[PDB]
Amino acid sequence: GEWEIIDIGPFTQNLGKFAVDEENKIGQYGRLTFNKVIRPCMKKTIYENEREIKGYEYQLYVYASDKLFRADISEDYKTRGRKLLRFNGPVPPP
């Protein structure tokens, strides 16, 4: 895809919250509460057919219950539906 850094304002904060809510449904790390999203946040755009946008993926660093996790989120272009792809950690700060 094509990659860019985006900042960590309200849009990205709500993506961090979405990731913690989705991970809480999974349960592998017990019950988490969102604390913060830190830099860098990466956005991948995926293209299909003749340079048509198929969707996005956002790579986030997220503090939840004081532990730092790496979360990857997909967003389908047509439906705007979001899905948690992976949530791993604790990871060292970037």
Residue 23 backbone phi and psi in degrees, to 5: -70, -35
Beta-bridge partner residues of 63: 36, 68
Exposure pattern of 45-62 as b/e (b: 16+ CB <10 Å)?
eeeeeeeeeebbbbbbbb
In sequence order, the 6+-apart residues with CB closer than 8 A to the CB of 18 are: 73, 82, 84
Q: How far is CA 24 from the centre of its chain?
A: 14
* 9: its two tokens: 């304002």
* 23: its two tokens: 């991970």
Burial class (CB in 10 A: 0-12, 13-18, 19+), 63: buried
Q: Is 32 helix (H, G, I), strand (E, B) or coil?
A: coil
In the block, which residue shows the tokens 């969102």? Answer: 34
CATH topology of domain 1-94: Nuclear Transport Factor 2; Chain: A, (3.10.450)
Q: What is the DSSP letter of 12?
A: H
Domain ranges (residues) in the chain:
1-94
Beta-bridge partner residues of 13: none
